[PDB]
């Protein structure tokens, strides 16, 4: 069985727990690690080359009080760094998370995710999201509450870890139904805005 420890980090309140819990089996088969106060969600995705399991480490809120302990990071093979596109300070703190992460983990593939893009009054827009470009990371807009772009970070990570740029997910995992609607037009605009931003500067 192919599996990877994936650490999910970012400021308190950015939507990490809401994001990981979208995956229904990941939630039903989650494991609590009492010593570190972590829940590990085993998220299986079915690819054209078979199942890949991401064991996603979600905190119990301790990130609100400072950096996470070494044991949280140890043996991570990949990571998602999340911020909230409605809270500029959460984006300002991304470089801190990246530092703390790479201090313990070095090499690993990392996706940067701007969460909550379902919220109309967006504060951190495409033109301001630069950190990934500075550090060779992949970026996605997401909305945990609507499942918007849910699979994207996992698929990018899988391709990187497996070393197969043509890897595909055969089907989406079973997800909790969207609690909010992600306006298709809005999504189209944000995707374009990221394209424009990517070709810019």
């Amino acid at each position: 069985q192919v599996q990877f420890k994936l650490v999910l980090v970012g400021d308190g309140g950015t939507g990490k727990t809401t994001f990981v819990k979208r995956h229904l089996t990941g939630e039903s088969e989650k494991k609590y690690v009492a010593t570190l106060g972590v829940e590990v969600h085993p998220l299986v995705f079915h690819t054209n080359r078979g199942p890949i399991k991401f064991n996603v480490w979600d905190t119990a809120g301790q990130e609100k009080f400072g950096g996470l302990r070494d044991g949280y990071y140890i043996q991570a093979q990949c990571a998602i760094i999340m911020f909230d596109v409605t809270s500029r300070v959460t984006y300002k703190n991304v470089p801190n998370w990246h530092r703390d992460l790479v201090r313990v983990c070095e090499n690993i593939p990392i996706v940067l995710c701007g969460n909550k893009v379902d919220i109309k009054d967006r504060k951190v827009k495409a033109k301001s999201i630069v950190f990934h470009r500075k550090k060779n990371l992949q970026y996605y807009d997401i909305s945990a509450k609507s499942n918007y772009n849910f699979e994207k970070p996992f698929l990018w990570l899988a391709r990187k870890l497996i070393g197969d740029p043509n890897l595909e997910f055969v089907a989406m995992p079973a997800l909790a139904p969207p609690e909010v609607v992600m306006d298709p037009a809005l999504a189209a605009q944000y995707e374009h805005d990221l394209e424009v931003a990517q070709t810019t500067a």
Binding site: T35, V40, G71
Partner: peptide, 26 residues
């Protein structure tokens, strides 16, 4: 040989008596 932690799922060495991550016993 190596052993997967049944508490946190991290892969550990044969030498390891406890998990390098979560300190759980083999």
């Amino acid at each position: 040989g190596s052993w997967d932690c049944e508490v946190c799922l991290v892969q550990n060495k044969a030498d390891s008596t406890k998990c390098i991550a979560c300190e759980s016993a083999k």
